[PDB]
Amino acid sequence: GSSGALLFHGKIPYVVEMEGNVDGHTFSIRGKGYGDASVGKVDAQFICTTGDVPVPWSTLVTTLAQCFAKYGPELKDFYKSCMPDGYVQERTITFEGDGNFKTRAEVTFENGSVYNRVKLNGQGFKKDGHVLGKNLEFNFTPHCLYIWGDQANHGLKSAFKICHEITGSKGDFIVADHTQMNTPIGGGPVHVPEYHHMSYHVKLSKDVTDHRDNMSLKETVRAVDCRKTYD
Amino acid sequence: GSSGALLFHGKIPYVVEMEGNVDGHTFSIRGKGYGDASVGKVDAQFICTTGDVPVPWSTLVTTLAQCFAKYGPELKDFYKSCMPDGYVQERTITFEGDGNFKTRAEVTFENGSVYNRVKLNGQGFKKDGHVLGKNLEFNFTPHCLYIWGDQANHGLKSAFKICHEITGSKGDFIVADHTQMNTPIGGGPVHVPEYHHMSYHVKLSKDVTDHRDNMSLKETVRAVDCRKTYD
């Protein structure tokens, strides 16, 4: 496919810088791992350098690199066609019965590696709700995303749902509703996608020997040509 | 396995009884076809008896039988487990920047035929919007549903998105946000579900010899064990 896709052969380091503010509580996070797009794998470790995180780690997972997705020859790959100059990624995330997050990322290739530099602002949460009351499990369900093209901006649009399990229930979930849009940083030719889906499977872990608040993960991510494979 | 499921071998006939009211306009639709649950397929033809539908046909498809889905041995099949007595299925459907549908349906097994009898009420639409203005294509995309358990009430919960393409844009979509709850009608024992997904692929047609406002469809539907398949 694209000449940007040349940069993703083999395993490549991944570096994350996040700044956050949820109803007055501020915090910074740093992450380090790798991605291998030939199989759609991402493996990474995260630490909060400022103190404790003010919300459950699972609500931050979607904001903490769709360029590592396994894309076959039959679909256009927007994310890698933008590389190395990169893309801006923006979301609004709205919690069932509670507040919302707004996010803005720059995702680029620099110095042999992928950088995700992202800012998060949270507003309108209940002080006794599941979020600010830290009442959600340290785990994660499999998801399916919807993706299509915006020919007017030579970009990408996406809409999906994410489920979070309630601490002290078993099989009761709230929903975080996701809307998203992506725009190129450079002015050069890119690949604008057509309608398709993307599967995610995430597993979370921790390390008790590190005294800082922490989280690790492993994920598998594939593009799905659903106009053909759901027949 | 469950006693309901044996009612489903081979082609089983399907009847639909639907009434609507969207801001001033009452209307009725009657449908007939069959479903074959061993391959997950459904065929059916629809007529509007009162005149022309006052919203585009695409917006009505999800309201117009999840008992015809292909379930393999590895997952609990709630819909089939309820039969022959049936279940109640209620939804709220909220359209991006416009109004909403509330629907209440009863789904039963009677004389070797499945019956879907359903009521729909619509409120808060704009006269110049894509819905009341009728400005959406006569076509459909593949979708993916999330399904889980509500043990407390021996019931089922579901949440998901549906895309509708805007006429005269090309490639741009509006989203219809769906929430759903199902409750057994009878008293027998049933299979409460666990977290899984369900795939859909739908194709619309017309019978152009016929003078009444009309629509046909064919569909493939299957349950998905995502905790293993997404790995």
CSV table of C-alpha atoms in Angstrom, one decimal:
chain,number,residue,atom,x,y,z
A,1,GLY,CA,0.0,0.0,0.0
A,2,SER,CA,1.4,3.4,1.1
A,3,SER,CA,5.0,4.5,1.4
A,4,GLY,CA,4.3,5.5,5.1
A,5,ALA,CA,3.6,1.7,5.8
A,6,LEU,CA,7.4,1.0,5.1
A,7,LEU,CA,8.2,2.4,8.6
A,8,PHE,CA,6.1,-0.3,10.4
A,9,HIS,CA,8.0,-3.6,9.4
A,10,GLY,CA,9.2,-5.4,12.6
A,11,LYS,CA,8.8,-4.2,16.2
A,12,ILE,CA,8.9,-0.4,16.8
A,13,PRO,CA,9.2,1.5,20.2
A,14,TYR,CA,6.1,3.4,21.4
A,15,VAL,CA,6.2,6.5,23.6
A,16,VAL,CA,3.3,8.2,25.5
A,17,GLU,CA,3.0,11.7,27.1
A,18,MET,CA,-0.3,12.6,28.8
A,19,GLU,CA,-1.6,15.7,30.7
A,20,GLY,CA,-4.9,15.5,32.5
A,21,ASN,CA,-7.5,17.6,34.6
A,22,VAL,CA,-10.9,16.0,35.8
A,23,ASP,CA,-13.0,18.6,37.8
A,24,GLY,CA,-9.9,20.2,39.4
A,25,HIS,CA,-7.6,17.1,40.0
A,26,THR,CA,-4.6,17.4,37.8
A,27,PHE,CA,-2.2,14.6,36.8
A,28,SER,CA,0.6,13.5,34.4
A,29,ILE,CA,1.3,10.0,33.0
A,30,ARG,CA,4.3,8.6,30.9
A,31,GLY,CA,4.3,5.3,28.9
A,32,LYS,CA,6.9,3.1,27.1
A,33,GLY,CA,6.5,-0.2,25.0
A,34,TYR,CA,6.4,-1.4,21.4
A,35,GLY,CA,4.0,-2.1,18.5
A,36,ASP,CA,4.2,-4.9,15.7
A,37,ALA,CA,1.6,-4.1,12.9
A,38,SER,CA,2.3,-7.4,11.1
A,39,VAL,CA,0.2,-9.1,13.8
A,40,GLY,CA,-1.7,-6.1,15.3
A,41,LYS,CA,0.0,-6.3,18.7
A,42,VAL,CA,0.7,-3.4,21.2
A,43,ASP,CA,2.5,-4.2,24.6
A,44,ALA,CA,3.1,-1.2,27.1
A,45,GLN,CA,3.8,0.0,30.6
A,46,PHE,CA,2.4,3.3,32.2
A,47,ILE,CA,3.3,5.2,35.4
A,48,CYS,CA,1.6,8.3,37.0
A,49,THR,CA,4.5,10.6,37.9
A,50,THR,CA,2.6,13.1,40.1
A,51,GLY,CA,0.7,10.9,42.6
A,52,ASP,CA,-2.4,8.8,42.3
A,53,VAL,CA,-4.8,9.0,39.2
A,54,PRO,CA,-8.2,10.5,40.2
A,55,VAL,CA,-10.4,8.1,38.1
A,56,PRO,CA,-10.3,4.3,37.5
A,57,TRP,CA,-7.4,3.2,35.1
A,58,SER,CA,-9.9,1.5,32.9
A,59,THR,CA,-11.6,4.8,31.9
A,60,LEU,CA,-8.3,6.1,30.5
A,61,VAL,CA,-7.4,3.1,28.3
A,62,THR,CA,-8.9,4.4,24.9
A,63,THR,CA,-7.0,7.8,25.2
A,64,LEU,CA,-3.6,6.1,26.1
A,65,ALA,CA,-2.3,4.2,18.3
A,66,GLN,CA,-4.5,2.8,15.6
A,67,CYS,CA,-1.5,2.9,13.2
A,68,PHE,CA,-0.4,-0.5,14.8
A,69,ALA,CA,-3.7,-2.2,13.6
A,70,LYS,CA,-3.3,-5.2,11.3
A,71,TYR,CA,-4.5,-4.0,7.8
A,72,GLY,CA,-4.5,-6.4,4.8
A,73,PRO,CA,-4.1,-5.6,1.1
A,74,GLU,CA,-7.9,-5.3,0.5
A,75,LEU,CA,-8.5,-2.1,2.6
A,76,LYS,CA,-7.1,1.5,2.6
A,77,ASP,CA,-5.0,2.2,5.7
A,78,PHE,CA,-5.4,6.0,6.6
A,79,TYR,CA,-3.2,5.9,9.7
A,80,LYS,CA,0.0,4.6,8.2
A,81,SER,CA,-0.5,6.6,4.8
A,82,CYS,CA,-0.2,9.9,7.0
A,83,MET,CA,3.3,8.8,8.3
A,84,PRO,CA,5.9,10.2,9.2
A,85,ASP,CA,4.2,13.7,9.3
A,86,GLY,CA,1.3,12.1,11.3
A,87,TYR,CA,-2.3,13.1,12.3
A,88,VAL,CA,-4.5,14.9,14.9
A,89,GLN,CA,-7.0,12.7,16.8
A,90,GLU,CA,-10.0,14.3,18.6
A,91,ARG,CA,-12.8,12.7,20.8
A,92,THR,CA,-15.8,13.4,23.0
A,93,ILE,CA,-16.5,10.6,25.5
A,94,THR,CA,-19.9,10.7,27.4
A,95,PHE,CA,-20.5,8.5,30.6
A,96,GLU,CA,-24.1,7.0,31.1
A,97,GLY,CA,-25.5,9.1,34.0
A,98,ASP,CA,-22.3,11.1,34.7
A,99,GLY,CA,-19.8,13.6,33.2
A,100,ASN,CA,-17.8,13.8,29.9
A,101,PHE,CA,-14.0,13.8,28.7
A,102,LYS,CA,-12.8,15.9,25.8
A,103,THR,CA,-9.4,14.8,24.2
A,104,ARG,CA,-6.9,16.1,21.5
A,105,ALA,CA,-3.8,14.1,20.4
A,106,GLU,CA,-0.9,14.5,18.0
A,107,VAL,CA,0.3,11.1,16.7
A,108,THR,CA,3.7,11.2,14.7
A,109,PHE,CA,6.7,9.1,13.8
A,110,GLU,CA,10.0,10.5,15.2
A,111,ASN,CA,13.5,9.1,15.9
A,112,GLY,CA,12.7,5.4,15.0
A,113,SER,CA,9.5,5.4,17.1
A,114,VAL,CA,5.7,6.3,17.4
A,115,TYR,CA,4.8,9.3,19.9
A,116,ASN,CA,1.3,9.8,21.2
A,117,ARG,CA,1.2,13.3,22.8
A,118,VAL,CA,-2.4,13.8,24.3
A,119,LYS,CA,-4.4,16.3,26.6
A,120,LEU,CA,-7.6,15.3,28.5
A,121,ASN,CA,-10.2,17.6,30.2
A,122,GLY,CA,-13.1,16.1,32.3
A,123,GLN,CA,-16.3,18.1,33.3
A,124,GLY,CA,-19.7,17.5,35.1
A,125,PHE,CA,-19.0,14.3,37.1
A,126,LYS,CA,-21.0,13.4,40.3
A,127,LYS,CA,-18.8,13.3,43.5
A,128,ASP,CA,-20.5,10.1,44.5
A,129,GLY,CA,-20.7,8.5,41.0
A,130,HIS,CA,-19.0,5.4,39.7
A,131,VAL,CA,-16.1,7.5,38.2
A,132,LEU,CA,-15.0,10.0,40.9
A,133,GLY,CA,-16.1,7.4,43.5
A,134,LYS,CA,-13.7,4.8,41.9
A,135,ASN,CA,-16.2,2.0,41.7
A,136,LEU,CA,-15.3,0.3,38.4
A,137,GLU,CA,-13.3,-3.0,38.0
A,138,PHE,CA,-9.5,-3.3,36.9
A,139,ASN,CA,-10.4,-5.3,33.8
A,140,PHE,CA,-11.6,-4.9,30.1
A,141,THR,CA,-14.1,-6.3,27.5
A,142,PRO,CA,-13.6,-7.0,23.8
A,143,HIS,CA,-14.9,-4.1,21.5
A,144,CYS,CA,-15.9,-3.4,17.8
A,145,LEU,CA,-15.4,0.0,16.2
A,146,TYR,CA,-17.1,1.6,13.1
A,147,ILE,CA,-14.8,3.6,10.7
A,148,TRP,CA,-15.5,5.7,7.5
A,149,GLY,CA,-14.1,8.6,5.3
A,150,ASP,CA,-14.6,12.3,5.2
A,151,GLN,CA,-13.7,13.3,1.7
A,152,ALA,CA,-14.2,17.1,2.4
A,153,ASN,CA,-11.3,17.2,4.9
A,154,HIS,CA,-9.3,14.3,3.4
A,155,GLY,CA,-9.8,12.6,6.9
A,156,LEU,CA,-11.5,9.9,9.0
A,157,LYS,CA,-14.6,9.7,11.2
A,158,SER,CA,-15.5,6.9,13.8
A,159,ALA,CA,-18.3,6.1,16.3
A,160,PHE,CA,-18.5,3.2,19.0
A,161,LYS,CA,-19.4,2.1,22.5
A,162,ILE,CA,-17.1,0.9,25.4
A,163,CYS,CA,-18.4,-1.1,28.4
A,164,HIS,CA,-17.0,-0.9,32.0
A,165,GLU,CA,-17.8,-3.4,34.8
A,166,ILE,CA,-19.2,-2.2,38.2
A,167,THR,CA,-17.2,-3.2,41.3
A,168,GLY,CA,-19.4,-5.5,43.4
A,169,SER,CA,-21.7,-6.6,40.6
A,170,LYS,CA,-21.2,-9.5,38.2
A,171,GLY,CA,-22.1,-8.8,34.7
A,172,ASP,CA,-23.7,-5.3,35.2
A,173,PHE,CA,-22.0,-2.7,32.9
A,174,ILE,CA,-22.2,1.2,32.3
A,175,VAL,CA,-21.4,2.5,28.8
A,176,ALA,CA,-18.9,5.3,27.7
A,177,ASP,CA,-20.1,6.6,24.3
A,178,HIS,CA,-17.3,7.6,21.8
A,179,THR,CA,-17.4,10.0,18.8
A,180,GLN,CA,-14.1,10.7,16.9
A,181,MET,CA,-12.4,12.6,14.0
A,182,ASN,CA,-8.8,12.4,12.5
A,183,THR,CA,-7.1,15.0,10.2
A,184,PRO,CA,-3.6,14.9,8.6
A,185,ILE,CA,-0.7,17.1,9.8
A,186,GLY,CA,1.0,17.3,6.4
A,187,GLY,CA,-0.4,18.5,3.0
A,188,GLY,CA,0.7,15.5,0.9
A,189,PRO,CA,-1.4,12.7,-0.8
A,190,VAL,CA,-3.1,10.3,1.8
A,191,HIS,CA,-5.5,7.2,1.6
A,192,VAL,CA,-9.2,8.2,2.5
A,193,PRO,CA,-10.9,5.0,3.8
A,194,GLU,CA,-14.3,3.4,3.0
A,195,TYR,CA,-16.8,2.0,5.6
A,196,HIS,CA,-15.3,-0.9,7.7
A,197,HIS,CA,-14.9,-2.3,11.3
A,198,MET,CA,-12.0,-2.9,13.7
A,199,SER,CA,-11.8,-5.5,16.5
A,200,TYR,CA,-10.0,-4.9,19.9
A,201,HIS,CA,-9.1,-7.4,22.7
A,202,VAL,CA,-7.3,-5.9,25.7
A,203,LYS,CA,-5.9,-7.5,28.9
A,204,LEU,CA,-4.7,-5.4,31.9
A,205,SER,CA,-2.0,-6.1,34.7
A,206,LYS,CA,-0.1,-4.3,37.5
A,207,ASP,CA,3.3,-4.5,39.2
A,208,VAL,CA,3.3,-4.3,43.1
A,209,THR,CA,7.1,-3.8,43.3
A,210,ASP,CA,6.9,-0.3,41.7
A,211,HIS,CA,5.8,2.1,44.5
A,212,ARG,CA,4.3,4.6,41.8
A,213,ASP,CA,0.6,4.1,40.7
A,214,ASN,CA,0.9,1.9,37.6
A,215,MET,CA,-0.7,-0.1,34.8
A,216,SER,CA,0.5,-2.5,32.0
A,217,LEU,CA,-1.3,-3.8,28.9
A,218,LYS,CA,-1.4,-6.2,26.0
A,219,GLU,CA,-3.7,-5.9,23.0
A,220,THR,CA,-4.7,-7.4,19.6
A,221,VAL,CA,-6.2,-5.0,16.9
A,222,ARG,CA,-7.4,-6.0,13.4
A,223,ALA,CA,-9.2,-4.2,10.5
A,224,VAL,CA,-12.3,-6.1,9.3
A,225,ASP,CA,-13.8,-6.0,5.7
A,226,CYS,CA,-17.4,-6.5,7.0
A,227,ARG,CA,-19.2,-5.9,3.7
A,228,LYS,CA,-17.7,-9.3,2.8
A,229,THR,CA,-17.0,-11.3,6.0
A,230,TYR,CA,-20.5,-10.9,7.7
A,231,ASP,CA,-22.2,-12.6,4.5
B,1,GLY,CA,-29.4,-26.9,25.2
B,2,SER,CA,-33.0,-25.7,25.8
B,3,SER,CA,-36.5,-27.0,24.9
B,4,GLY,CA,-37.4,-23.9,22.7
B,5,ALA,CA,-34.6,-24.6,20.3
B,6,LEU,CA,-36.0,-27.8,18.8
B,7,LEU,CA,-38.9,-25.7,17.5
B,8,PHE,CA,-36.4,-24.2,15.1
B,9,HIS,CA,-35.2,-26.9,12.7
B,10,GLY,CA,-35.6,-26.0,9.0
B,11,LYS,CA,-37.5,-23.1,7.4
B,12,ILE,CA,-40.1,-21.6,9.8
B,13,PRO,CA,-42.7,-19.1,8.7
B,14,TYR,CA,-42.7,-15.4,9.9
B,15,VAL,CA,-45.6,-12.8,10.2
B,16,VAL,CA,-45.2,-9.1,11.2
B,17,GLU,CA,-47.9,-6.8,12.6
B,18,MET,CA,-46.8,-3.1,13.0
B,19,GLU,CA,-48.5,0.2,13.8
B,20,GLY,CA,-47.0,3.7,14.0
B,21,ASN,CA,-47.5,7.3,15.0
B,22,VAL,CA,-44.8,9.9,14.3
B,23,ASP,CA,-45.8,13.5,15.2
B,24,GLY,CA,-49.3,13.6,13.7
B,25,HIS,CA,-49.0,10.8,11.1
B,26,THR,CA,-50.6,7.3,11.9
B,27,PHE,CA,-49.7,4.3,9.6
B,28,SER,CA,-49.7,0.5,9.4
B,29,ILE,CA,-47.4,-2.1,7.8
B,30,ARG,CA,-47.9,-5.9,7.4
B,31,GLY,CA,-45.1,-8.4,6.5
B,32,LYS,CA,-44.6,-12.1,5.8
B,33,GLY,CA,-41.7,-14.4,5.1
B,34,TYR,CA,-39.6,-17.1,6.9
B,35,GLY,CA,-36.4,-17.6,8.9
B,36,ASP,CA,-33.9,-20.5,8.9
B,37,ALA,CA,-31.9,-20.5,12.1
B,38,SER,CA,-29.4,-23.3,11.2
B,39,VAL,CA,-27.7,-20.8,8.7
B,40,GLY,CA,-29.0,-17.6,10.4
B,41,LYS,CA,-31.0,-16.3,7.5
B,42,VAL,CA,-34.2,-14.3,7.1
B,43,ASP,CA,-36.3,-13.3,4.0
B,44,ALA,CA,-39.4,-11.0,4.1
B,45,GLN,CA,-41.6,-8.7,2.1
B,46,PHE,CA,-43.4,-5.6,3.5
B,47,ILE,CA,-46.5,-3.4,2.4
B,48,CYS,CA,-47.7,-0.1,3.9
B,49,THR,CA,-51.6,-0.5,3.9
B,50,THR,CA,-52.5,3.1,4.9
B,51,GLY,CA,-50.5,4.8,2.1
B,52,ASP,CA,-46.9,6.1,1.9
B,53,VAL,CA,-44.6,5.8,5.0
B,54,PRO,CA,-43.9,9.3,6.4
B,55,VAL,CA,-40.2,8.4,7.4
B,56,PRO,CA,-37.7,6.7,5.1
B,57,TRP,CA,-37.8,2.8,5.0
B,58,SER,CA,-34.2,2.5,6.3
B,59,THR,CA,-35.1,3.9,9.8
B,60,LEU,CA,-37.8,1.2,10.3
B,61,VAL,CA,-35.7,-1.9,9.6
B,62,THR,CA,-34.5,-2.7,13.2
B,63,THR,CA,-38.1,-2.5,14.5
B,64,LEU,CA,-39.4,-4.8,11.7
B,65,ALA,CA,-36.6,-11.4,15.5
B,66,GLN,CA,-33.4,-12.3,17.1
B,67,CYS,CA,-34.6,-15.9,17.6
B,68,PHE,CA,-33.5,-16.6,14.0
B,69,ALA,CA,-29.8,-16.0,14.8
B,70,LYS,CA,-27.2,-18.7,14.4
B,71,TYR,CA,-26.0,-19.8,17.9
B,72,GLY,CA,-23.4,-22.5,18.1
B,73,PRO,CA,-23.0,-24.9,21.1
B,74,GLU,CA,-20.6,-22.6,23.0
B,75,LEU,CA,-23.1,-19.7,24.0
B,76,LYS,CA,-26.4,-19.5,25.9
B,77,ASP,CA,-29.3,-18.6,23.4
B,78,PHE,CA,-31.8,-16.5,25.4
B,79,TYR,CA,-34.2,-15.8,22.6
B,80,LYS,CA,-34.9,-19.5,21.8
B,81,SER,CA,-35.0,-20.5,25.4
B,82,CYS,CA,-38.2,-18.4,25.9
B,83,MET,CA,-40.2,-20.2,23.3
B,84,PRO,CA,-42.9,-21.1,22.6
B,85,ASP,CA,-44.4,-18.6,25.1
B,86,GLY,CA,-42.2,-15.6,23.9
B,87,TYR,CA,-40.6,-12.4,25.2
B,88,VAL,CA,-41.3,-8.6,25.4
B,89,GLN,CA,-38.6,-6.4,23.5
B,90,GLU,CA,-38.5,-2.6,24.3
B,91,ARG,CA,-36.1,0.0,22.7
B,92,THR,CA,-35.3,3.8,22.7
B,93,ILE,CA,-33.7,5.0,19.4
B,94,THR,CA,-32.3,8.6,19.4
B,95,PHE,CA,-31.3,10.2,16.1
B,96,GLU,CA,-28.3,12.5,15.9
B,97,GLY,CA,-29.4,16.1,16.2
B,98,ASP,CA,-33.1,15.2,15.7
B,99,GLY,CA,-35.9,13.2,17.5
B,100,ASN,CA,-36.6,9.7,18.8
B,101,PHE,CA,-38.5,6.4,18.6
B,102,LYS,CA,-39.9,4.4,21.6
B,103,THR,CA,-40.9,0.8,20.6
B,104,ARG,CA,-42.7,-2.0,22.4
B,105,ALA,CA,-43.0,-5.5,20.7
B,106,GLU,CA,-44.2,-9.1,21.6
B,107,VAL,CA,-42.6,-12.0,19.9
B,108,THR,CA,-44.3,-15.5,20.1
B,109,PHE,CA,-44.4,-19.0,18.6
B,110,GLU,CA,-48.0,-19.9,17.5
B,111,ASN,CA,-49.1,-22.7,15.0
B,112,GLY,CA,-45.6,-23.3,13.7
B,113,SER,CA,-45.3,-19.6,12.8
B,114,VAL,CA,-43.2,-16.8,14.6
B,115,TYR,CA,-45.2,-13.6,15.3
B,116,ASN,CA,-43.7,-10.1,15.8
B,117,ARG,CA,-46.5,-7.7,17.0
B,118,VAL,CA,-45.0,-4.2,17.6
B,119,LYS,CA,-46.0,-0.5,18.4
B,120,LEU,CA,-43.8,2.6,17.6
B,121,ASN,CA,-44.3,6.3,18.8
B,122,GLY,CA,-42.0,9.2,17.4
B,123,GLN,CA,-41.5,12.6,19.0
B,124,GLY,CA,-39.3,15.8,18.7
B,125,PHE,CA,-38.4,15.7,14.9
B,126,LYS,CA,-37.6,18.7,12.7
B,127,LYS,CA,-39.7,19.2,9.5
B,128,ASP,CA,-36.6,20.1,7.5
B,129,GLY,CA,-34.4,17.2,9.0
B,130,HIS,CA,-33.2,14.2,7.2
B,131,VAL,CA,-35.9,12.0,8.8
B,132,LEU,CA,-39.2,14.0,8.1
B,133,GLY,CA,-37.7,15.5,4.9
B,134,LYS,CA,-36.9,12.1,3.8
B,135,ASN,CA,-33.3,12.6,2.7
B,136,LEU,CA,-31.7,9.1,3.4
B,137,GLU,CA,-30.6,6.4,0.9
B,138,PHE,CA,-32.6,3.2,0.3
B,139,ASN,CA,-29.6,0.9,1.3
B,140,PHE,CA,-28.0,-0.5,4.5
B,141,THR,CA,-24.5,-1.2,6.1
B,142,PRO,CA,-23.2,-4.2,8.2
B,143,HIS,CA,-23.5,-3.7,12.0
B,144,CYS,CA,-22.3,-5.4,15.3
B,145,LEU,CA,-24.4,-5.5,18.5
B,146,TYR,CA,-23.2,-5.8,22.1
B,147,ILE,CA,-25.4,-8.3,24.3
B,148,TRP,CA,-25.3,-9.1,28.1
B,149,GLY,CA,-27.3,-10.5,31.1
B,150,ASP,CA,-29.5,-9.0,33.8
B,151,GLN,CA,-29.7,-11.8,36.4
B,152,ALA,CA,-31.9,-9.9,38.8
B,153,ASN,CA,-34.8,-10.0,36.4
B,154,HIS,CA,-34.0,-13.2,34.4
B,155,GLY,CA,-33.6,-10.9,31.4
B,156,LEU,CA,-31.4,-9.5,28.6
B,157,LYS,CA,-29.8,-6.1,27.8
B,158,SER,CA,-28.3,-4.7,24.6
B,159,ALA,CA,-26.7,-1.4,23.3
B,160,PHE,CA,-25.4,-0.4,19.8
B,161,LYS,CA,-25.2,2.0,16.8
B,162,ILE,CA,-26.8,1.9,13.3
B,163,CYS,CA,-25.5,4.1,10.4
B,164,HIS,CA,-27.8,5.7,7.7
B,165,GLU,CA,-26.3,7.2,4.5
B,166,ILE,CA,-27.4,10.9,3.6
B,167,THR,CA,-28.7,11.3,0.0
B,168,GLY,CA,-26.7,13.8,-1.9
B,169,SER,CA,-23.8,13.7,0.4
B,170,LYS,CA,-21.9,10.6,-0.6
B,171,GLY,CA,-20.0,8.8,2.0
B,172,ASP,CA,-21.5,10.7,4.9
B,173,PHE,CA,-23.6,9.1,7.7
B,174,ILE,CA,-26.1,10.0,10.5
B,175,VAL,CA,-26.1,7.7,13.6
B,176,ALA,CA,-29.2,6.2,15.3
B,177,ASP,CA,-28.2,5.3,18.9
B,178,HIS,CA,-30.1,2.1,20.2
B,179,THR,CA,-30.7,0.9,23.8
B,180,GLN,CA,-32.7,-2.4,24.4
B,181,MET,CA,-34.3,-4.7,27.2
B,182,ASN,CA,-36.0,-8.2,26.8
B,183,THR,CA,-38.3,-9.9,29.4
B,184,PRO,CA,-39.8,-13.4,29.3
B,185,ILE,CA,-43.6,-13.6,28.9
B,186,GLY,CA,-44.1,-17.1,30.4
B,187,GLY,CA,-43.1,-18.7,33.7
B,188,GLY,CA,-40.7,-21.5,32.6
B,189,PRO,CA,-37.0,-21.7,33.3
B,190,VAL,CA,-34.7,-19.7,30.9
B,191,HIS,CA,-31.0,-19.2,29.8
B,192,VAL,CA,-29.7,-15.8,31.1
B,193,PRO,CA,-26.9,-14.6,28.7
B,194,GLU,CA,-23.3,-13.7,29.2
B,195,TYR,CA,-21.3,-10.9,27.4
B,196,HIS,CA,-21.0,-11.5,23.6
B,197,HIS,CA,-21.5,-9.8,20.2
B,198,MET,CA,-23.8,-10.4,17.2
B,199,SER,CA,-23.1,-9.6,13.5
B,200,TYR,CA,-25.7,-8.4,10.9
B,201,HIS,CA,-25.6,-8.1,7.1
B,202,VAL,CA,-28.8,-6.7,5.4
B,203,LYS,CA,-29.8,-6.1,1.7
B,204,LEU,CA,-32.9,-4.0,0.7
B,205,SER,CA,-35.0,-4.4,-2.5
B,206,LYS,CA,-38.3,-3.3,-4.1
B,207,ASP,CA,-41.2,-5.1,-6.1
B,208,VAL,CA,-41.5,-2.5,-8.8
B,209,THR,CA,-44.6,-4.3,-10.4
B,210,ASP,CA,-46.5,-3.3,-7.2
B,211,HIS,CA,-48.2,0.1,-6.9
B,212,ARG,CA,-48.3,0.3,-3.0
B,213,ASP,CA,-45.4,1.7,-1.0
B,214,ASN,CA,-43.2,-1.4,-0.5
B,215,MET,CA,-39.9,-3.0,0.7
B,216,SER,CA,-38.1,-6.4,0.7
B,217,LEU,CA,-35.0,-7.7,2.5
B,218,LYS,CA,-32.5,-10.6,3.0
B,219,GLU,CA,-30.3,-11.0,6.1
B,220,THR,CA,-27.5,-13.0,7.7
B,221,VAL,CA,-27.3,-13.0,11.5
B,222,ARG,CA,-24.8,-14.8,13.8
B,223,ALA,CA,-23.7,-14.7,17.5
B,224,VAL,CA,-19.9,-14.2,18.2
B,225,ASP,CA,-17.8,-15.4,21.1
B,226,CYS,CA,-15.6,-12.4,21.1
B,227,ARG,CA,-13.5,-13.3,24.2
B,228,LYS,CA,-11.9,-16.0,22.1
B,229,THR,CA,-12.4,-14.9,18.5
B,230,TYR,CA,-10.8,-11.3,18.9
B,231,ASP,CA,-7.5,-12.7,20.3
